Amino acid sequence: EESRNTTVLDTTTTLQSSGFGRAFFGEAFNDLKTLMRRYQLYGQLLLSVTTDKDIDHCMFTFPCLPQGLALDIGSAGSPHEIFNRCRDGIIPLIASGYRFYRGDLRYKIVFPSNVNSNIWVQHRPDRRLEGWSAAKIVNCDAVSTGQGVYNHGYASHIQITRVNNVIELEVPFYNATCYNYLQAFNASSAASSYAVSLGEISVGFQATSDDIASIVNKPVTIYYSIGDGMQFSQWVGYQPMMILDQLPAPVV
Amino acid sequence: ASHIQITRVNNVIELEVPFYNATCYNYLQAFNASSAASSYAVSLGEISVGFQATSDDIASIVNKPVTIYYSIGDGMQFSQWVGYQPMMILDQLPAPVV
Amino acid sequence: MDNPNPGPDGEGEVELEKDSNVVLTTQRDPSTSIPAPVSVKWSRWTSNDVVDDYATITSRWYQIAEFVWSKDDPFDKELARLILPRALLSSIEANSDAICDVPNTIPFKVHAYWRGDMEVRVQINSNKFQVGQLQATWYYSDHENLNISSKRSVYGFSQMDHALISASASNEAKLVIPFKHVYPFLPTRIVPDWTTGILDMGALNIRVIAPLRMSATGPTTCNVVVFIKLNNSEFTGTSSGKFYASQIRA
Amino acid sequence: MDNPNPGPDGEGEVELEKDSNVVLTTQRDPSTSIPAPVSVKWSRWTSNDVVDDYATITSRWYQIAEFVWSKDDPFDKELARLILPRALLSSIEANSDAICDVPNTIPFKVHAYWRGDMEVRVQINSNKFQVGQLQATWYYSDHENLNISSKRSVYGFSQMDHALISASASNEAKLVIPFKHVYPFLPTRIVPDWTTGILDMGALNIRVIAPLRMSATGPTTCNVVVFIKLNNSEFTGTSSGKFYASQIRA
Amino acid sequence: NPSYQQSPRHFVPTGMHSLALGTNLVEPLHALRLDAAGTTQHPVGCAPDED
Amino acid sequence: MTVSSIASRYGLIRRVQWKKDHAKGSLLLQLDADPFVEQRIEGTNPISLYWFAPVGVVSSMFMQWRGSLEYRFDIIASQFHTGRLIVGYVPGLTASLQLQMDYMKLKSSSYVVFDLQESNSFTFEVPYVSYRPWWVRKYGGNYLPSSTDAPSTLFMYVQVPLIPMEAVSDTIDINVYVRGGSSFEVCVPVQPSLGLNWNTDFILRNDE
Amino acid sequence: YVQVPLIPMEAVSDTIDINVYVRGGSSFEVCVPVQPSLGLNWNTDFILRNDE
């Protein structure tokens, strides 16, 4: 059995329990659900406009999942230095150790401040996630389907960039499942792909093609926490880890 | 009844357009205006939005988007059940072939 | 204490485990490992059809794997990656006959969807002088994960709960697997929204933690036999047997 | 009394007969005929194996015969000599697929012996202007008798109890057949002490007492469909499905 | 959705809290702690001997 | 205004021609067991309009649905037509298994045999059998993935063929109405898969 | 270490594997949440930023 304990050959005395730092620091760290609610950087992108965008056209999209995105180090010339150097963060390091999840997510998208244009945000729970490839932030090209535009019935919110350039969200668990998958996802079953991400958030600017030039190559950073309903269910052990301070230094 | 949104504080004005008709209730399908007084009974009114800018600041206004939203505001009561018309299915609309 | 008196009947006490008409005995106490608490029934939410567990036939034991575990098998070595709701059917189709020939699996031929628990007994028949140790680990939805090809080692399945089968004790591994899939039913056949990966709840996989060790004239091989019960089942969606296709051979 | 007011819904009351997931309706009252009182269970006397009726699947209705009854059929005319525990299986094998493909008959593929009652509904779809009359009669163990080839007429089956299916009323014939065989179980397959005449409790046979009569431009044909329920069953002797052989074609 | 139609507040913004005030004044902040009620604590040997 | 009051209204969805010369196994309809049962208008417009039941339009604004449907079959006949027909229900047919059907494979699943003698209307309440507590919408927005076919299929064969008298007609129309049942319910509000016919103009944006 | 060396019988093997498992004890506890020292193996690609 795993956690069996045959003969405890104890040489120790009693050690005074601090209450996971409650006695020293005034706060307990036993519950790992409340450490998961500290906001972690989810994604990081430069706004790259390809074709002439209408007011409806979504600037970028991303599938919304607590597992972390398919990790974008970046191009081999210009790497995103946090996901290159500070690999994976905390929430998929804890969600790496579980199998199922049932709950909500929070996002707090941070926009550039040079832009002024009004920003809409759609949650689209219809969208299936076709594999861990393209489980990432997609700078959208010219519109071919209803994926690429503002849509009607889905839950949206419009942040005014002139008042405050951060929209803060609560993306609900709108799946027809018991719980969703939490590791990396290869999409074996065709309906299994309805059960990975909570939905598919698309952020779009309402600017015309004359104000679209101030938008180009400005950073948009996304955060996430797990929003008080998140319950990771089945214990699955961790995979092989990589130690970060053994990564090579950029030799001059 | 008017309201003035200051664009420098917040560029969104949020409204509640009341039922100011002399009717029992207004028409809800598409409207062909048979009777001359029937046309007083479709829309709640007619909202007009206008800027207070002169003709020198009017050039920054040109070809900027204004989007309008709506919901039904807690007093809305659709009355007589009439079945739906022929619908069109959206994912059968043709894709923009390259 | 410690009064050995063997006779013609033998020495120890033999424990049983009776089912419908299958009794299988073990001398040794099991190393039970239960990865989740027992599942609720859940036919209320998604089935109006007549639902019945066929517990007089489905809850019998049935052998689904037997394999020689030699000393030639190294340390980090798979022995059987059994996909257990599939392996009950693919073992029968590996016996070169249909699913309807076995009493345990005739409602898989008829019904469309299944939800139930699974008992697994991974019995070993090693000698007392052989030295080695297996682990039997259940992973929920192996094939819905793509980095499991790197997790699949004895260091990674020792972290989740698992059974240990020591070759000295000739130990037996009880393994109670309740139903935890994403969707509350597993289809037994090609269903409209998924066709690939049918009846795949996960993988029982049996790695080696210590290989067999012995003298030069010791017994080299070691046979391991895996039995499965399907106890708290329920079948729904009565359908024709001609829509059931054969499982993938694997 | 006598106030006819038809509407868009029709005039009369429709009675149902629901089973597991099969509801079949008749406008008319049945002409029930019950040849014997209901049989006792009798697994206590000859079975230690796990016995269970599969009432969620076996007690469904299943069509086992349909035949055109034309006016060209004369007076003393067989229409269907159904051997009912066989005809449930030979109808399926007449549909060019196996016994394990149908939910009603999968325990015949597995189990070795069967004892149970049988409901039979011989439904007709004649016109109101057609004139004629069938009788549906159950004979216990037809093929264990050699002078039945002379008894098999409408004068001989009118003496035992039977149902009447008049073509004017479009009548329905309920027929509750309890188990009365010499031995308290019918084997579903080739059993050591008898091989020939397997699963033969007797014969439902449907003679003609009055042929169809009509005008020159009247509706000539008349379709008759026979359904069977297997309600108070029990199956014993769990065996392999590979010992079950196909029924004789007849 | 009741519509709230009463008149709202009418304030003054300021960019910063007081630097001067330090006694009778609950000063709101953005704590870099993980607990919102957490305060540094002084156990029995970490006690402040000198007021 | 309420989904359980809009979906609880029969809308005519199918007109079935049931003749005398249909055999004892002829298919009359094989429509899907979802609220998006279809009747297409044979019009001359470049985009085809469509009739839906009220359960289909009120279920088209939602991502998911569950629960029993109710089909009312009005077999328009006099009391001198006699017939009998299976209305069955196969849980879980993909499109490759949609063919190779007959009424004998239908009788292995849930089915209902109706006797047309005097009363000439019946309601088959279609079960909800799926592996999923809800069920994702058939069409979706203009987006070709996330287009999931029905949980199951509704069939209607001819069990016993029609036997009409020589004074009444050889043919019978069967109207098929769809209603969201007592257990029908929809949940997540997404983009409607339907548009109105009030403006059927559509602009193709080709890049030429 | 090996206090008394292994004395196997001539029918059993001369060698023995010893598995060593680690668990946080009953008194084990951690406090301050900082950047994890570990990364996943889900994407082991690493980009060296040399200036050449």
From TrEMBL, chain B:
Domain of life (superkingdom): Viruses
Localization, UniProt: Virion
Name under which the protein is recorded: Genome polyprotein
Protein's organism: Deformed wing virus
Included range, full protein: 1057 to 1154 of 2893
TrEMBL record, chain E:
Top-level lineage group: Viruses
Compartments in which it is found: Virion
Signal peptide positions (record): none
Protein name: Genome polyprotein
Full protein segment contained here: 487 to 537 of 2893
TrEMBL record, chain F:
Subcellular location: Virion
The protein's name: Genome polyprotein
Species in which this protein is naturally found: Deformed wing virus (DWV)
Residues of the full protein shown: 538 to 745 of 2893
From TrEMBL, chain G:
Subcellular locations according to the entry: Virion
Protein name per Swiss-Prot or TrEMBL: Genome polyprotein
Organism, scientific name: Deformed wing virus (DWV)
Residues of the full protein shown: 694 to 745 of 2893
